[PDB]
Assembly symmetry: D2
Homo-oligomer: 418 residues x 4
């Protein structure tokens, strides 16, 4: 589980180098199952979720190794089942299914539980791989998928916006016969990236980043080297860190165009923001943030994954702000913990009413999920005295060396026994 | 982390002896902090949360022992802080606060952080105590209370129904100057039980079990012996166990009039129910349950602690039924775990739409909270094949020897360490 | 249609005499169908709903006359249908069903369709009477209920708290063979009034006002005189009127023990409340009110029928308040109307975020339902300038002489035709 | 106001010619206020809301007339107030504000106005115009908006998706100084249509149909001739008529590509659907539809304007299906009216659970809003016996000649006084 001991108050200033998007790396690592020649994925973050995806890849008969690059030779994939002991730690492994069905005519993947931020069914994936020509059963907790021909292009209208299911259908439409159209498709940048990875293999895909994606099937996919775009959430995390610590950060190796909504909100909070080609800078000029109202929705709107972060921005901000969460049903678990640190918040349905306070007080708190965990470490940074954040394993899933990266911003953080 | 390996299918049938209410034993344990003479609480279940209560009682300087009975002598209580290490292992610990404030004019309890099943704030405990004349501050994650001398009785109209806040205010009001009226009090049998235990010590309480509790404050409370009432939720858990397994069960040492709503729904579901003075029989007559619609609400309505169990009943029942949870905002975490087992559910907000299936399949599942853990075990008993329920430590909080009791009904359960 | 022209701002001053409860008068008027000897119901407010009840009664064959009192002779009832044409104007007329079935073994009432404030099903009425041994179908949009002989007493556990269902089952149960127990009964004061009316007629009822009502069926009910309790919602409306206008008021012929939650909220808002045996005074002391947090729930909690009024209070209060409606789902139609008058509101799910303003401005607004109309009139009193409230007939359903009572408090109101 | 008498059951079959979209005609009519030379809008349906728009336009000092076409000469527009007496009967008149501010430097529009289906604030309309430079106050219930000179282009990020606020800002921006970007713009086909109308007048717009609309502002807009696209909601409504009545319809003058989601849900229901350039056919082949689950959301997802109709479809389909409504908080008022007809429906906050029945039964029912009115008329056609739908004024707002169109499909419908 272990813990970060964070000593605050600490003004966060300097630079950080933004890492590859965890949420691009993962779907790309499973889409690599489609490749019949070796793939090299660059700018991959050293995250627990990447390690797990790698152990799952090797489990399926891929040869995998890594250092910023991950090498994947899926030429001899000979196992088609992602075991429970892996999927239980990474629900993103559902992404193994579509590729394996589309290349190998079969795939078996443990049906994910059971998540704290919401229930997160995969009905859209394992519909989707059905409207394509897959037959799917569930036996002993394994989603068993087969096509005893080869996949067939379909006009698919997604009845919910889903990042996960759009990736699945997209990836598993690159080896279909015919055209697949995906209506009401997710447009997050990770999906644009996965698509552009797939074209590097020689897939035919149009309109990634839009609400309609067109895939004409191909016979097989090759190899190639692909650089994963920067993590927009980790970027938003370090930008927020400075916003709430009255600081100034320059995020380098970044993609500002992935962040229209979040940058608008930090400006709304009174951050001085300049954007270059591959960097975002932010200076509070010594100033407490101003309270903003926020409403999560699918890209290009404000991301649910910045929600916990902006909640904390508000709780230390000037005035009252409203954080409405529309994507996940139970994503306010940070709030009772921030409350222990002296935050004044109220939860009405999927809205938290945040009455900004000048300073938080250090306290022992419990991280509940990835983005919560980071928000608590941020809260620790700017709180008076000692904060101990428990269950820090959550952070290790989606942030590479956050302790290092925050320490270079002046943070006082020690990873502690547990 | 211990797990249960449950083997199915198996018909659950025979006889079970209901243990004391976990949820009467706990509030009475903290209420014993008011006692100035030794106290014996009889029929206390051997449960983890009782152990935790005992640790915290001892850490406040009470002398505490147990076998059936837990003996407390709070004469020499001399520490008034409930520390983070304890509270965070059970939030019920907030119940030390009213006693300490009322008897000692001071009390500190770690502000509970969030919970798997909901945010669970304690605003009403705090405001209730404020209305009794307490000053309360939050310093360093600790809820600090103090009064100049004695608390003062007040007319308190509760903003919402809260079992825990009703207990807090009721216990504190017993040593206040004057009359306290709690309007819109919770009416749970455990509140009747706690009030009757307080009466045994010498408190003057009227209207327990009703929406209006009247307490006449006394200078001092003494000792006494009180037997805790039967666990209604344990009772319902085993009643469900027979129902979903087309079985027959007799619960001894029950208290039927605590279960009006659960027995009405079980009847709705097709159960042949009979009651005596201290026993309930259920017989399905070898037939699959019929689906039911349930809406959780405070006592005497259908209790939220039976919700996960009935979600299960509905998911193997004939036809379609819904469960709406109005008490906790995130108590559907058993649902995806049952989905792995072949259940067909759809969560739309605070409602679970269930389409009953004839058979479940054994799968590796994850217990997330107490009542979910038991439902997962119960699903294990009726599924075909092997179910492993991980994180069984949850069950240990609120069930006394559930493995031995199910085994006696015919269950095939082994406790497995790794 | 008639409108009120209201001129403000007006400080609302003096005293009002509270009329009898619309919501005790109505169920009592229907219960009188059980009566085989003349009945006089005293203190009945002169209201459109009463006139409608009397019209329906005359149409079933009761002889009905009215001034203070309404006199009913149901000895000659010989028509057993409540037609659509009348139910459509007043859904309370579902209340004829239970009497007619219980006394005459048959009863037809048009199934109430939707309602401004929520869907309002009557599924709990039908189930209650079915549980008493009534066969019930729906043909041509009529609920048609029938028994052979008399009804039969039953142990009935109510799914949800229902005022209307509790009355329905309680009145029917008076002429049933055997004992009827209603668990999770509604505890509203109007239920107590209705039970006590039934008792005057020779019925055997205990536990009214508590969550379990027990009824011992008799062969036949008599007649009697019975005075209806004061209207707690009227009292609350006039207390709110004073509270929002910087006023002082005294409500004569009140019953303060019905208004615990309301008086407590007006206290949290900074009102000076005193009570007598039969009066309530409120005095703001030159004060504009202060924002509060309301959660509606069944009696004794804050009543949904005071919610529109308190929303009003919050929207002119100094501060930010939440009004949360748990009883009726769409009971927020006043909000956009008050918005026209300058209120800063914001509806989010089943809560309204009010951000109290200092002044309202007069505007042409539209009454949508009863309590909403009252709120808009009261808004008009404290708004600067002229407010015109259209569709004022809603108010006449449920308030006797509202305009006269307000004018005696110093309001400048004129009823207009077109 | 008058009523429809429908005699069922009728199998609806034949052809229908779809009218121009009410919801393109309407923003197009108000966009015409920007035009400095006469405009002819072609394919405008003859509907109450067009008449009202026409009346409002005339009042603002446009010369307007109609037959197929509506002609508008807005050259001499010189009254800049949309008054309460017109706006109260049509929400969409809020659309007069933007054009008047953009072209004349000022506009006044009565703030709507409260609506049955939800509260419907226009805060995003206000805030988008303030972001383009307007100063907006609210005075006696009128939104009064002024700018000195032209508006100034702005990057506007919309916090929620709003069709109305998208059109407001897009129209106003056409005369703004410089460039305007709408982020999180609605994508509805009517927004595309309005943009293309605007372009016909010499506006420079791109991105319409996507989440980001770019408007480069121009000096003046001219005139031209523009044909409104087909009504996708009328189309959907007759497609559902064919579906629920186990019939066959061909819709002529359709635009199949505006209905991906609806067509996919109708296939899910067992419909055999074929599409051409300008036609859709649906043939059920004598079959009862199968129950489907529906989630409304902004286009291209399932439209909320089809939800009542598909609710109706589920309520007569085979099986159980759920309709979740994510756009408008109170759009289930058709349900309790369908309940009078023998529908088995259950509403649980924002979801209706439908358990389809073979046949509905004719009954007197009351329309509450436009799409509800239409669904009750459809329910009428297929119900057994006689249905009288009251308050059919709702239908006349958004359907042209639905009675003649339905009769041509074989329906037995008479318009009646009742
Ligand atoms: C790995 C990744 O990428 N992640 C992410 C994503 O997730 P997902 O899961 O993919 O999501 P979606 O899908 O979009 O979701 C939404 C909604 O919908 C629903 N669903 C889904 C699917 C299906 O099939 N069905 C359904 O229903 C769900 O439940 C929900 O509600 O994405 C997201 C969004 O953005 C994000 O947030 C995520 O990320 C995270 C959260 C994860 O990872 C975990 O941790 C982070 O990162 O934090
Ligand atoms: C220990 C015990 O007893 N437990 C139980 C109880 O809990 P509580 O916490 O006490 O609850 P309440 O309070 O009643 O709650 C409800 C509601 O409300 C709210 N709140 C509260 C308080 C305050 O202050 N504030 C507020 O807001 C909350 O959130 C909720 O929602 O009770 C219950 C009911 O019946 C039960 O469930 C319980 O039990 C359990 C769950 C335990 O574990 C813990 O909780 C079981 O299962 O056992
Ligand atoms: C006439 C009278 O009394 N009224 C009143 C009453 O109402 P009701 O209708 O009776 O109500 P309830 O029943 O309680 O209700 C509640 C709830 O539940 C539901 N439900 C019912 C029944 C059945 O069966 N089912 C069901 O579900 C509904 O929906 C709801 O949600 O009472 C009330 C309460 O408190 C009141 O509010 C009333 O009053 C009024 C509103 C009138 O209008 C009537 O309408 C006023 O305002 O006055
Ligand atoms: C005339 C027309 O077009 N209509 C239509 C529309 O409406 P509107 O109003 O525009 O809507 P929206 O906006 O989209 O809405 C959505 C949501 O959001 C909200 N909001 C808005 C605005 C503002 O400012 N704020 C806010 O918040 C609201 O409330 C809601 O929730 O569109 C719609 C949608 O799709 C439709 O539905 C409509 O249509 C109708 C209904 C009419 O009539 C009305 O308007 C029909 O047609 O039916």
């Amino acid at each position: 589980m272990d813990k970060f001991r964070v000593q605050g108050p600490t003004k966060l200033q300097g630079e950080v180098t933004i890492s590859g998007a965890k949420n691009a790396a993962l779907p790309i690592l499973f889409a690599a199952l489609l490749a019949e020649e070796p793939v090299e994925i660059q700018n991959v973050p050293k995250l627990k979720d990447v390690d797990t995806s790698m152990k799952l890849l090797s489990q399926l008969g891929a040869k995998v190794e890594r250092x910023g690059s991950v090498h994947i030779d899926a030429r001899d994939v000979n196992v088609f089942c992602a075991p429970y002991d892996l999927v239980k730690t990474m629900r993103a492994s559902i992404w193994a299914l579509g590729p394996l069905v589309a290349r190998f005519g079969q795939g078996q993947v443990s049906l994910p539980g059971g998540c704290t931020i919401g229930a997160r069914p995969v009905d859209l994936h394992i519909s989707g791989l059905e409207q394509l020509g897959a037959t799917i059963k569930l036996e002993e907790g394994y989603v068993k998928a087969s096509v005893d021909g080869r996949l067939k292009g379909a006009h698919i209208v997604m009845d919910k916006v889903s990042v996960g299911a759009t990736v699945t259908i997209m990836c598993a439409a690159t080896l279909a016969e015919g055209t697949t159209i995906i209506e009401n498709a997710a447009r997050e940048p990770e999906i644009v990236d996965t698509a552009n990875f797939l074209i590097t293999l020689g897939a035919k895909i149009s309109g990634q980043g839009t609400d309609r994606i067109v895939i004409e099937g191909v016979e097989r996919l090759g190899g190639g080297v692909y650089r994963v775009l920067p993590d927009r959430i980790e970027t938003g995390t370090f930008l927020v860190a400075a916003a709430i610590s009255r600081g100034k950060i320059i995020c380098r190796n970044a993609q500002p165009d992935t962040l229209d909504a979040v940058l608008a909100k930090l400006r709304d909070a009174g951050a001085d923001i300049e954007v270059g080609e591959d960097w975002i800078s932010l200076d509070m000029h010594g100033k407490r943030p101003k309270a903003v109202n926020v409403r999560t929705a699918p890209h290009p709107a404000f991301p649910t994954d910045m929600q916990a972060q902006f909640t904390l921005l508000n709780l230390v901000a000037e005035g009252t702000g409203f954080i409405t969460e529309t994507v996940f049903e139970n994503r306010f678990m940070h709030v009772p913990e921030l409350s222990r640190m002296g935050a004044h918040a109220e939860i009405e349905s999927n809205t938290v009413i945040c009455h900004g306070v000048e300073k938080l007080s250090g306290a022992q708190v419990m991280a509940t999920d990835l983005r919560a965990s980071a928000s608590l470490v941020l809260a620790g940074c700017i709180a008076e005295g000692t904060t101990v954040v428990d269950r820090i394993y959550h952070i290790d899933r989606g942030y590479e060396r956050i302790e290092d990266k925050l320490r270079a911003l002046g943070a006082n953080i020690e990873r502690v026994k547990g």
